[PDB]
Write an enzyme that holds these catalytic residues in place. Structure first.
Site, PDB file in Angstrom:
ATOM      1  N   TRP A   1       0.816  -1.207   0.000  1.00 21.19           N
ATOM      2  CA  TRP A   1       0.000   0.000   0.000  1.00 21.19           C
ATOM      3  C   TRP A   1       0.858   1.269   0.000  1.00 21.19           C
ATOM      4  O   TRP A   1       0.421   2.293   0.520  1.00 21.19           O
ATOM      5  CB  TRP A   1      -0.939  -0.009   1.219  1.00 21.19           C
ATOM      6  CG  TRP A   1      -1.835  -1.216   1.332  1.00 21.19           C
ATOM      7  CD1 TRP A   1      -3.141  -1.313   0.949  1.00 21.19           C
ATOM      8  CD2 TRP A   1      -1.489  -2.502   1.892  1.00 21.19           C
ATOM      9  NE1 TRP A   1      -3.629  -2.563   1.221  1.00 21.19           N
ATOM     10  CE2 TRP A   1      -2.642  -3.314   1.800  1.00 21.19           C
ATOM     11  CE3 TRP A   1      -0.327  -3.042   2.455  1.00 21.19           C
ATOM     12  CZ2 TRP A   1      -2.658  -4.633   2.251  1.00 21.19           C
ATOM     13  CZ3 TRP A   1      -0.346  -4.345   2.903  1.00 21.19           C
ATOM     14  CH2 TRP A   1      -1.497  -5.127   2.803  1.00 21.19           C
TER      15      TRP A   1
ATOM     16  N   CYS B   1      -7.339  -4.908  -0.393  1.00 24.29           N
ATOM     17  CA  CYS B   1      -8.642  -5.408   0.033  1.00 24.29           C
ATOM     18  C   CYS B   1      -9.510  -5.886  -1.133  1.00 24.29           C
ATOM     19  O   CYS B   1      -9.925  -7.044  -1.152  1.00 24.29           O
ATOM     20  CB  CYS B   1      -9.374  -4.389   0.904  1.00 24.29           C
ATOM     21  SG  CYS B   1      -9.174  -2.654   0.405  1.00 24.29           S
TER      22      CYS B   1
ATOM     23  N   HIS C   1     -12.932  -0.399   2.746  1.00 22.94           N
ATOM     24  CA  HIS C   1     -12.476  -1.768   2.908  1.00 22.94           C
ATOM     25  C   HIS C   1     -13.493  -2.692   2.245  1.00 22.94           C
ATOM     26  O   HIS C   1     -14.697  -2.488   2.392  1.00 22.94           O
ATOM     27  CB  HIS C   1     -12.300  -2.095   4.394  1.00 22.94           C
ATOM     28  CG  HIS C   1     -11.882  -3.503   4.647  1.00 22.94           C
ATOM     29  ND1 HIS C   1     -11.027  -4.188   3.812  1.00 22.94           N
ATOM     30  CD2 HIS C   1     -12.196  -4.352   5.632  1.00 22.94           C
ATOM     31  CE1 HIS C   1     -10.837  -5.409   4.289  1.00 22.94           C
ATOM     32  NE2 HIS C   1     -11.538  -5.530   5.393  1.00 22.94           N
TER      33      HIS C   1
ATOM     34  N   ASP D   1     -13.610 -12.235   5.153  1.00 18.46           N
ATOM     35  CA  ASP D   1     -12.614 -11.200   4.916  1.00 18.46           C
ATOM     36  C   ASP D   1     -11.264 -11.829   4.571  1.00 18.46           C
ATOM     37  O   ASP D   1     -10.474 -12.128   5.463  1.00 18.46           O
ATOM     38  CB  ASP D   1     -12.497 -10.263   6.109  1.00 18.46           C
ATOM     39  CG  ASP D   1     -11.851  -8.917   5.817  1.00 18.46           C
ATOM     40  OD1 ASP D   1     -10.861  -8.890   5.058  1.00 18.46           O
ATOM     41  OD2 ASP D   1     -12.333  -7.905   6.365  1.00 18.46           O
TER      42      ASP D   1
ATOM     43  N   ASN E   1     -18.356  -0.320  12.963  1.00 16.77           N
ATOM     44  CA  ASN E   1     -18.776   0.305  14.209  1.00 16.77           C
ATOM     45  C   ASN E   1     -17.567   0.920  14.906  1.00 16.77           C
ATOM     46  O   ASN E   1     -16.579   0.237  15.159  1.00 16.77           O
ATOM     47  CB  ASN E   1     -19.484  -0.675  15.140  1.00 16.77           C
ATOM     48  CG  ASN E   1     -20.770  -1.203  14.549  1.00 16.77           C
ATOM     49  OD1 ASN E   1     -20.833  -2.369  14.144  1.00 16.77           O
ATOM     50  ND2 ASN E   1     -21.791  -0.362  14.465  1.00 16.77           N
TER      51      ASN E   1
ATOM     52  N   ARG F   1     -10.119  11.648  32.408  1.00 15.71           N
ATOM     53  CA  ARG F   1      -9.884  13.087  32.410  1.00 15.71           C
ATOM     54  C   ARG F   1      -8.382  13.363  32.508  1.00 15.71           C
ATOM     55  O   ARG F   1      -7.592  12.443  32.702  1.00 15.71           O
ATOM     56  CB  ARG F   1     -10.638  13.743  33.575  1.00 15.71           C
ATOM     57  CG  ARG F   1     -10.371  13.117  34.939  1.00 15.71           C
ATOM     58  CD  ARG F   1     -11.157  13.769  36.070  1.00 15.71           C
ATOM     59  NE  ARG F   1     -10.467  14.925  36.662  1.00 15.71           N
ATOM     60  CZ  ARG F   1      -9.948  14.986  37.891  1.00 15.71           C
ATOM     61  NH1 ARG F   1      -9.974  13.932  38.693  1.00 15.71           N
ATOM     62  NH2 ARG F   1      -9.387  16.107  38.317  1.00 15.71           N
TER      63      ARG F   1
ATOM     64  N   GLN G   1      -0.130  18.847  41.617  1.00 13.70           N
ATOM     65  CA  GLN G   1       0.625  20.018  42.038  1.00 13.70           C
ATOM     66  C   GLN G   1       0.529  21.063  40.926  1.00 13.70           C
ATOM     67  O   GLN G   1       0.056  20.762  39.831  1.00 13.70           O
ATOM     68  CB  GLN G   1       2.041  19.558  42.399  1.00 13.70           C
ATOM     69  CG  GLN G   1       2.838  20.530  43.265  1.00 13.70           C
ATOM     70  CD  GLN G   1       3.842  21.365  42.498  1.00 13.70           C
ATOM     71  OE1 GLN G   1       3.908  21.332  41.263  1.00 13.70           O
ATOM     72  NE2 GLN G   1       4.648  22.120  43.231  1.00 13.70           N
TER      73      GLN G   1
ATOM     74  N   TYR H   1      -3.053  31.489  21.554  1.00 15.87           N
ATOM     75  CA  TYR H   1      -4.240  32.251  21.915  1.00 15.87           C
ATOM     76  C   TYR H   1      -5.179  32.371  20.714  1.00 15.87           C
ATOM     77  O   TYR H   1      -6.382  32.550  20.896  1.00 15.87           O
ATOM     78  CB  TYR H   1      -3.855  33.632  22.464  1.00 15.87           C
ATOM     79  CG  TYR H   1      -3.679  33.735  23.976  1.00 15.87           C
ATOM     80  CD1 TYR H   1      -4.586  33.143  24.851  1.00 15.87           C
ATOM     81  CD2 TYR H   1      -2.617  34.442  24.533  1.00 15.87           C
ATOM     82  CE1 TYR H   1      -4.439  33.243  26.226  1.00 15.87           C
ATOM     83  CE2 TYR H   1      -2.461  34.551  25.907  1.00 15.87           C
ATOM     84  CZ  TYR H   1      -3.371  33.947  26.755  1.00 15.87           C
ATOM     85  OH  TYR H   1      -3.223  34.045  28.109  1.00 15.87           O
TER      86      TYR H   1
ATOM     87  N   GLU I   1      -8.650   2.280  39.131  1.00 17.33           N
ATOM     88  CA  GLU I   1      -8.282   3.487  38.417  1.00 17.33           C
ATOM     89  C   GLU I   1      -6.784   3.471  38.140  1.00 17.33           C
ATOM     90  O   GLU I   1      -6.045   2.677  38.716  1.00 17.33           O
ATOM     91  CB  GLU I   1      -8.643   4.714  39.252  1.00 17.33           C
ATOM     92  CG  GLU I   1      -7.859   4.792  40.559  1.00 17.33           C
ATOM     93  CD  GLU I   1      -8.055   6.077  41.339  1.00 17.33           C
ATOM     94  OE1 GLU I   1      -9.004   6.829  41.025  1.00 17.33           O
ATOM     95  OE2 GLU I   1      -7.237   6.328  42.250  1.00 17.33           O
TER      96      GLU I   1
ATOM     97  N   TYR J   1      -2.197  26.452  31.643  1.00 22.22           N
ATOM     98  CA  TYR J   1      -1.564  27.762  31.673  1.00 22.22           C
ATOM     99  C   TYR J   1      -0.348  27.715  32.593  1.00 22.22           C
ATOM    100  O   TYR J   1      -0.489  27.471  33.790  1.00 22.22           O
ATOM    101  CB  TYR J   1      -2.538  28.850  32.137  1.00 22.22           C
ATOM    102  CG  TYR J   1      -1.916  30.240  32.214  1.00 22.22           C
ATOM    103  CD1 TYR J   1      -1.502  30.903  31.064  1.00 22.22           C
ATOM    104  CD2 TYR J   1      -1.748  30.893  33.433  1.00 22.22           C
ATOM    105  CE1 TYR J   1      -0.929  32.163  31.121  1.00 22.22           C
ATOM    106  CE2 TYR J   1      -1.182  32.157  33.502  1.00 22.22           C
ATOM    107  CZ  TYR J   1      -0.771  32.793  32.344  1.00 22.22           C
ATOM    108  OH  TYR J   1      -0.213  34.037  32.403  1.00 22.22           O
TER     109      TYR J   1
END
Ligand SMILES: [Cl-]
Lengths: 650, 5
Positions: A241, A277, A324, A347, A382, A443, A448, A483, A506, A550
């Site tokens: 490819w 493909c 594809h 496939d 999906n 997130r 600190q 900015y 976590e 910042y």
């Protein structure tokens, strides 16, 4: 008294067989017929003819290198009037002076492939066995009892007999119809397809069992699939490819399957160069159509919009492409639960046998435990993408668009998107998303606080709130941002291929942001944009998280030397602590403030200031009036400019 | 050609 029979010859009846079995093109030299359907031989005899009262005739068929009756690859059966349904039988339909017309039937679940036909003519006390010849037995979409049965002639014509169609390339909004020569009924192809089977890994593993299992269009389809692009040398095509196809032929150049099959064979079954493909799918389609399994090439389209981190993630195998192509084949699935008869996705693009067949209805329902390789197909149509920037569905990337295929018996595209996906936001589309992807949230964090000059950590704080462990990929990177919207060079990148997330747990995943990195690529903004992309690659769901940062300037300390009475006698103490690790050159203060001074006191500094080394100066103030008053300061350096500060008094 | 995003 009666003498044994001598066969002059055996007529294969290539015309009437080719006609009735829809194999007219494949019956130039050799008998090819489809299973579950009567075909015709005519025995010519030298001398006395068959007499049912005298002679007893038996036939033997073998297929493959290790035939056995139990495996279905061997069968013996007599010549007699009573013809059992669904068994190997032979019976007489005509008898003239010299000839004897036979009618042979095969089971609808008979193994496909090459057979050697033998006849044993036993006359009274004697007998003589010998070979008649060979027929090739194919899949029969016309046969109601066959697993590949298909009840519409127009569809049988399209998906089996038609040797040209369209393969759809381009993009969702600019679809192009590329014409293709399947040529499943050209010279050599049938033999080459048969070879493809007899070189397949399962045949080497257990040739006898393999030939037995070629009764199943599931099995054959699966085998047909992983052989077009094998990781072996025996595979048909080599993918490439990188617009560097000077070694062989260009993927875009091909207009047919045929020439690729031939090249492959004619050079010791070695990868032809090169494919992509849609070339793999066409090759699979040809092979499948040839063997009699109703098949079609499909194109699924994707579209991606804004350097969004997804685009960045890919920009530098199981990835997301402009389009594809794979194939669907038509068969029952008695290996599965009831109701999965129909189109099965296969496939042949990069068990090594991947991917499929898997029911298309299983993908739309998200029953991803349905064999074979349901999650891989599901992933192709999906992708759930979600943002956080303090949930918020992202649409910079759409997968599962205009899934296309050639309409039956017309030069037109048929949109088949509805077969893969429910309508967006429907009760079904959600119901099925559930069945697929049985609390996960992320997130950015700092912890600190951040000072222009200092190095510091940022965290992708991922929270598996659910009971299910996930294995994710994590890209966590930082660039400078302006900015007025521009994005600068990289100043921190951490990629993690394997990130496990143990249930109800976590992680805070650190990246170090170094002065050395950002310091010289920063703008007056002092703005670093941190961005985490979390990939669950199985379901193809994504979590994006971004946060701007910042880098604050150092505070100017200001102290009130003297007493606050509504009279005089005051002095100013104003200090800044250099936060950099470098010589801060040409330092100066300005101080002013109406009600404290009427003489802006500029004080220069001849001593360069070091790292950490602070810098105090003084100024005498003559206050005049009583009420609230604010002193105001500015600071300048060679490499650190315009750091303000103030202090209230009385 | 088949192109990666
Ligand atoms: Cl046997």
């Amino acid at each position: 008294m009666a003498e044994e029979l001598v066969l002059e010859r055996c007529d294969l009846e290539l015309e009437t067989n080719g006609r009735d079995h829809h194999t007219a093109d494949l019956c130039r030299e050799k008998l090819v017929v489809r299973r579950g359907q009567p075909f015709w031989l005519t025995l010519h005899f030298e001398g006395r003819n068959y007499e049912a009262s005298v002679d007893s005739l038996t036939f033997s068929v073998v297929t493959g290198p290790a035939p056995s009756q139990e495996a279905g690859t061997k069968a013996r059966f007599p010549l007699r009037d009573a013809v059992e349904e669904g068994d190997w039988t032979a019976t007489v339909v005509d008898q003239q002076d010299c000839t004897l017309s036979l009618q042979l039937t095969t089971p609808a679940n008979a193994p496909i492939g090459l057979y050697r036909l033998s006849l044993e003519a036993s006359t009274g006390y004697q007998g003589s066995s010998f070979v008649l010849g060979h027929f090739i037995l194919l899949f029969n979409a016309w046969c109601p009892a066959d697993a590949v049965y298909l009840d519409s002639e127009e569809e049988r014509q399209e998906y089996v007999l038609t040797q040209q169609g369209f393969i759809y390339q381009g993009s969702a909004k600019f679809i192009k119809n590329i014409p293709w020569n399947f040529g499943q009924f050209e010279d050599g192809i049938l033999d080459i397809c048969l070879i493809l089977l007899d070189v397949n890994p399962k045949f080497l593993k257990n040739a006898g069992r393999d030939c037995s299992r070629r009764s199943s269009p599931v099995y054959v389809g699966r085998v047909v699939s992983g052989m077009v692009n094998c990781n072996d040398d025996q595979g048909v095509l080599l993918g490439r490819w990188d617009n560097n196809y000077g070694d062989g032929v260009s993927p875009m150049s091909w207009i047919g399957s045929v020439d690729i099959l031939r090249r492959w064979k004619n050079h010791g079954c070695q990868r032809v160069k090169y494919g992509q493909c849609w070339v793999f799918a066409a090759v699979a389609c040809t092979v499948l159509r040839c063997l009699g399994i109703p098949t079609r090439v499909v194109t699924n389209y994707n579209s991606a919009h804004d350097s969004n981190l997804l685009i960045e993630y890919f920009r530098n195998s199981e990835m997301i492409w402009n389009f594809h192509c794979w194939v669907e084949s038509w068969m029952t699935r008695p290996d599965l639960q009831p109701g999965y008869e129909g189109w099965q996705a296969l496939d042949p693009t990069p068990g090594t046998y991947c991917c499929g067949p898997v029911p298309v209805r299983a993908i739309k329902e998200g029953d991803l435990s349905t064999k074979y390789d349901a999650p891989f197909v599901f992933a192709e149509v999906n992708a759930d993408v979600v943002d956080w920037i303090q949930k918020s569905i992202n649409r910079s990337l759409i997968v599962g668009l205009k899934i296309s295929t050639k309409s039956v018996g017309r030069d037109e595209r048929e949109d088949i998107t509805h077969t893969y996906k429910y309508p967006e936001g429907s009760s079904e589309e959600r119901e099925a998303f559930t069945r697929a992807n049985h609390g996960m949230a992320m997130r950015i964090r700092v912890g600190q606080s951040m000072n222009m000059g200092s190095d510091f950590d940022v965290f992708a704080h991922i929270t598996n709130n659910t009971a299910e462990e996930y294995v994710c990929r994590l890209l966590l990177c930082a660039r400078t941002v302006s900015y007025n919207g521009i994005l600068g060079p990289e100043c921190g990148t951490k990629y993690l291929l394997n990130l496990n997330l143990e249930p109800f747990s976590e992680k805070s995943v650190p990246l170090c942001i170094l002065y050395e990195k950002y310091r010289d690529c920063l703008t007056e903004s002092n703005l670093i944009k941190v961005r985490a992309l979390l990939v669950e690659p199985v379901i193809n769901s994504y979590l994006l998280a971004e946060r701007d940062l910042y880098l604050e300037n150092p505070e100017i300390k200001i102290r009130i030397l003297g007493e606050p009475k509504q009279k005089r006698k005051l002095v100013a103490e104003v200090s800044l602590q250099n936060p950099l690790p470098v010589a801060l050159e040409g330092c100066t203060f300005t101080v002013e403030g109406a009600g404290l001074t009427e003489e802006q006191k500029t004080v220069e500094i001849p001593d360069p200031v070091e790292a950490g080394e602070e810098v105090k100066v003084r100024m005498d103030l003559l206050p005049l009036h009583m009420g609230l008053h604010k002193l105001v300061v500015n600071f300048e350096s060679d490499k650190l400019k315009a750091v303000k500060g103030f202090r209230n008094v009385i | 050609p088949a192109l990666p995003f």
